[PDB]
């Protein structure tokens, strides 16, 4: 047997959480779990620890699963302290601990979150490689651990086919928060369409007032608003326009009891691996204040086992503190004065986005064409990226199917149109003909390109 304790703090529904796990048949395994519920109006740190280790003597508890209605930036970091003091695993998703980066101990036994902040930057790169968006500016305050993060997303070079395009990182000291003599002297780089901004909600509430004071409003949007840092979509102040493009996994958790059952399966699978390879169960600690050394040395095989475990097609190999490779991620849509919701989908390499256009705070044309010799050449897409590098067009061919893969178009007239777009102002909606009857008039009507001309479809040809 092993001991798994669940703790919920804050108002929640322990019945759906109870019922979800007690139908999970963990037989066909060598070890079986042992659940223990503990509720919740008590909220001091000392009561929490002195409650956990208050229990921790009667039952053999191998660990604690805590909750999503707390603020874990504060108390929770000390878990790696107590974890290395107790050698017991602690997993989870939960609360204020949204992508916490710290210098936790080597002997701590705990993994948490989902993707890393650089894996998050990698999906942010896959986002900018969907619409070929290129960063003109980054602005980050002096956190204790920001500048290494940006200097790693900077050092993650991207090979050409693409603009690599940094032009400005900006570290500003927010101690001396003189928005007149510091944030004004550090601007003027905002004449550019893309600005990255990695901060917290409160200092964004300050700096969005400064950005409104200078005139960083119109321009439309200001670009990266990382959700996982300042995660409260309900009570965010909004002193700017829309915002919230970005990514967390924080779909309102359709999967939270499934996350609990998956984590229980992870722990039980690791213990099953120990029984298959060594078989011996390390006895859990039995005290906190008394004889606290408690069979002092323990096999470091569990830290190696916590990483080598995977659950069927779902859980990833759990190596970097709790920073996985391909957990499910979501994308959010875009206003804070009207609490807009999720608009994207991400799964394990792939991105699906159902807006297709950038809002801006009529020069949009549909354009219907035809494949021929070297005026409009149609070629297939790259098998690694989907998009097209030198061809720069969707050409959304119908089969109807305006979701058929956006075949690349090359040739002479496209090179003419790409100059005429910058000449006045344009926006494409490029697609191919379907009936294949370009330039034909039959009895009554026209077909092909002239057929989509006579049908008044907001066109060029």
């Amino acid at each position, epitope marked *: *047997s092993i001991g798994i304790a669940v703790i919920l703090v804050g108002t929640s529904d322990e019945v759906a959480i109870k019922d979800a796990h*007690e*139908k999970d*048949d*963990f*037989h*066909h395994l060598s070890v*079986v*779990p*042992r*659940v223990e519920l503990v509720a919740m109006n008590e909220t001091d740190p000392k009561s929490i620890i002195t409650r956990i280790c208050d229990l921790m003597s*009667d039952r*053999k508890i191998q660990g604690v699963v805590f909750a999503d209605d707390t603020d874990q930036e504060a108390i929770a970091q000390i878990l790696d302290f107590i974890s290395a003091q107790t050698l017991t695993p602690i997993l989870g998703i939960h609360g204020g601990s949204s992508m916490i980066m710290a210098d936790k101990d080597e002997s701590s036994m705990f993994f948490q979150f989902g993707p890393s902040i650089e894996q998050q930057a990698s999906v942010m790169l896959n986002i900018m490689e969907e619409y070929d968006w290129y960063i003109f500016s980054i602005v980050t305050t002096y956190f204790p651990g920001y500048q290494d993060f940006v200097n790693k997303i900077r050092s993650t070079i991207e090979n050409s086919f693409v603009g690599w395009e940094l032009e400005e990182v900006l570290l500003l000291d927010m101690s001396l928060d003189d928005g007149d003599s510091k944030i004004q002297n550090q601007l003027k780089k905002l004449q550019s369409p893309i600005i990255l901004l990695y901060c917290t909600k409160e200092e964004a509430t300050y700096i969005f007032e400064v950005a409104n004071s200078v005139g960083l409003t119109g321009y439309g949007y200001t670009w990266i608003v990382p959700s996982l840092v300042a995660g409260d979509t309900d009570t965010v102040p909004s002193e700017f326009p829309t915002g919230l493009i970005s990514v967390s996994y924080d779909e309102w958790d359709y999967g939270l009891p499934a996350r609990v059952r998956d984590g229980i399966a992870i722990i039980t699978t690791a213990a099953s691996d120990m029984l298959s390879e060594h078989s011996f169960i390390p006895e859990p600690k039995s005290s906190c204040y008394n004889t606290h050394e408690k069979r002092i040395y323990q096999s470091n095989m569990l830290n190696r086992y916590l990483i080598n475990v995977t659950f069927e097609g779902r859980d990833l190999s759990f190596s970097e503190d709790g920073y996985q490779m391909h957990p499910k991620l979501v994308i959010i849509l875009l206003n804070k004065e009207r609490k807009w919701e999720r608009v994207g989908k991400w799964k394990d390499k792939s991105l699906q986005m159902k807006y297709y256009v950038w809002p801006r705070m009529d020069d949009h044309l549909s354009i219907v064409t035809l494949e021929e010799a070297p005026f409009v050449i149609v070629e297939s897409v790259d098998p690694l990226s989907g998009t097209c590098m030198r061809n720069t067009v969707p050409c959304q061919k119908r089969i109807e199917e305006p979701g058929y893969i956006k075949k690349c178009c090359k040739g002479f007239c496209i090179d003419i149109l790409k100059k005429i777009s910058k000449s006045v102002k344009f926006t494409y909606d490029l697609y191919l003909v379907t009936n294949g009857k370009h330039g034909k008039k039959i009895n009554g009507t026209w077909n092909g390109m002239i057929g989509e001309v006579v049908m008044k479809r907001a066109y060029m040809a």
Partner: antibody
Framework: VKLQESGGGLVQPGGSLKLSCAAS??????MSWVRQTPEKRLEWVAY???????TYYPDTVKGRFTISRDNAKNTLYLQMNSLKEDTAMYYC???????????????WGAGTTVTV | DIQMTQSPSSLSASLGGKVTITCKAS??????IAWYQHKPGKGPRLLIH???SLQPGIPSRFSGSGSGRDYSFSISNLEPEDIATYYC????????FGGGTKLEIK
């Protein structure tokens, strides 16, 4: 929820009598049952989990006994072979706090006998 | 598997006496204790949890103390509707049982 036993007998000397205890939620609830000595000892008989797995016994009746359960009809199934020196009473007991683990029942059955 | 042995064989006491029966298992139980009482042919009645926690409906006539693997359970001030026989349970591994004793009144 209440527990009611059935299938009482030891009509063949050295035979096999599949006894049961029906219930009226028992699907997340394990099962283990009890015979009584002439010294009245509440000795254990068998072990199943709630999900049919975890098929075990104590050292008294090992080697002869075939064990299963069905959580749809809320019944246990085990054939008695080595009670042939006892005039035992058997009851069913459903341990509290559910799960594939075990806890302290007040949820016991009714109590029926097996006489040779 | 772990096996238990209760002791000894007798509950010879008068009306309102004092008796004590010992849980003795082969392995460490970490105060995994229960206590049951029944008439011949009636059925068990729960007494005792982890910290000798009595049951609602069970009077304060029953107390106990002990730890680790050895536990003592004392009955006093006994009214003869409790003509019974007392039994101890451990559940470190799945369930555990020993002999136990029966009650007679002199």
């Amino acid at each position: 929820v209440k527990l009611q036993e059935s299938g009482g007998g030891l009509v063949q000397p050295g035979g096999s009598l599949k006894l049961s205890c029906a219930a009226s939620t028992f699907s997340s609830y394990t099962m283990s049952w009890v015979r009584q000595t002439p010294e009245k000892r509440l000795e254990w008989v068998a072990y199943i989990s709630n999900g049919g797995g975890g098929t075990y016994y104590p050292d008294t009746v090992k080697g002869r006994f075939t064990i299963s359960r069905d959580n749809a009809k809320n019944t246990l199934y085990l054939q008695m072979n080595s009670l042939k020196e006892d005039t035992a009473m058997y009851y069913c007991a459903r341990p509290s706090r559910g799960g594939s683990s075990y806890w302290y029942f007040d949820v016991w059955g009714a109590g029926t006998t097996v006489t040779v | 598997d772990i096996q238990m042995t209760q002791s000894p064989s007798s509950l010879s006491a008068s009306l309102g006496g004092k008796v004590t029966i010992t849980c003795k298992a082969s392995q460490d139980i970490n105060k995994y204790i229960a206590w049951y009482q029944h008439k011949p042919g009636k059925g068990p009645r729960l007494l005792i949890h982890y910290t000798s926690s009595l049951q609602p409906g069970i009077p304060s006539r029953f107390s106990g103390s002990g730890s680790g693997r050895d536990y003592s359970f004392s009955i006093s001030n006994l009214e003869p509707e409790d003509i019974a026989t007392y039994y101890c349970l451990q559940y470190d591994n799945l369930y555990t049982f020993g002999g136990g004793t029966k009650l007679e009144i002199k």
